[PDB]
């Protein structure tokens, strides 16, 4: 066994395109529409609960997730990929900030940490 894929699966093509990032963006394009609007005294994020079956209980599937008491996240694309990113985002908010400074991270820095996880999946083996 052992993970013997220690090399990049995302690589530059002769035209300078990173194929796997482009294709990932294509998957996002197919995904259900989600939006965000910033007001003077708040922000709103919204999406459609595209229920796969009417027998399914769509309340048990959360597309809009709390990351910190003052930060929320919504997505478009692959739901499972979103769910694990929310788990990583919630944890990194604690490990790389709250357990150091005794307060929740500002929006931009938590976004920065989520961004770093998504960049690494673009270059890591």
């Amino acid at each position: 066994m052992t993970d013997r894929y220690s090399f990049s699966l995302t690589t530059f093509s002769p035209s300078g395109k990173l194929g796997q990032i482009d294709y990932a963006l294509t998957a996002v394009k197919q995904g259900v529409t989600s939006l965000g609007i910033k007001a003077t005294n708040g922000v709103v994020i919204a999406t459609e609960k595209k229920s796969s079956s009417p027998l399914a209980m769509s309340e048990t599937l959360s597309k809009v997730s709390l990351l910190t008491p003052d930060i929320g996240a919504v997505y478009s694309g692959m739901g499972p990929d979103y769910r694990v990113l929310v788990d990583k985002s919630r944890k990194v908010a604690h490990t790389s900030y709250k357990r150091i400074y005794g307060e929740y991270p500002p929006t931009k820095l938590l976004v920065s940490e989520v961004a770093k996880i998504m960049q690494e999946a673009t270059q890591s083996g």
Binding site: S62, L66, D87, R90, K91, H94, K98, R99, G102
Partner: protein
């Protein structure tokens, strides 16, 4: 330090004194020993002050993540299990002695945990240098089916025993009441029976009393423009 936890009809109450000591010296005359693991799970710590505070925030952090992961309000038995497994792994080198109380979907709970990783269950518990003073009051006045008002009374009376009779304890009484199907109410300085009397004299000095060698403005601002 004097800490008590008392079970009542529809919940649990936790109380503590407000004195932190560096041996014989009193560092803080109004310390806050009542810590929050989660909104409806509060605990109070004796022993190494850094350790009790640190171990609460770590388990409190992991409990919040667990709650988010499971979409469920955190349970006292979870906080309990995580605290004892952490403290046991460090074989008492983390000197954290806690009384853990709270309400969850299961009901109301009251546990104690020692630095080595042993845990205790009961309807009334005490901890710290003033635990014997407090336990004397609890053993004298505790009864089954206490009301909220009776439990707060018994808890604060048990802390007062510690304040007066134990040198390790003093100053004020902090209380937190955790009732089922309600928000946990944190009552800070619930009792203040140790206010210092006005001094005989003012020690405000005439201006220019101290001898000065040099003076200078300290630049706290960043490097300026132009």
């Amino acid at each position: 330090t004097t800490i008590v936890g008392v079970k009542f009809n529809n919940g649990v109450v936790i109380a503590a004194d407000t004195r932190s000591t560096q041996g014989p010296i009193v560092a803080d005359k109004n310390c806050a020993k009542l810590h929050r693991i989660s909104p409806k799970i509060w605990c109070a710590g004796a022993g190494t002050a850094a350790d009790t505070e640190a171990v609460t925030q770590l388990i409190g952090s992991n409990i919040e993540l667990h709650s988010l992961y499971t979409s469920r309000e955190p349970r006292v038995v979870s906080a309990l299990q995580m605290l004892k497994q952490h403290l046991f792994k460090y074989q008492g080198h983390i000197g954290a002695y806690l009384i853990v109380a709270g309400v969850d979907p299961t009901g109301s709970h009251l546990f104690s945990i020692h630095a080595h990783g042993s845990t205790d269950v009961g309807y009334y518990l005490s901890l710290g240098s003033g635990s014997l003073a407090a336990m004397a009051v609890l053993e004298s006045h505790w009864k089954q089916d206490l009301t909220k008002e009776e439990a707060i009374k018994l808890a604060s009376d048990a802390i007062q025993a510690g304040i007066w009779n134990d040198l390790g304890s003093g100053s004020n009484v902090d209380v937190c009441v955790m009732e089922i199907g309600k928000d946990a109410e944190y009552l800070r300085n619930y009792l203040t029976p140790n206010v210092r009397e006005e001094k005989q004299k003012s020690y405000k000095f005439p201006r220019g009393t101290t001898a000065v060698l040099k003076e200078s403005i300290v630049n706290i601002c960043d490097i300026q423009e132009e």
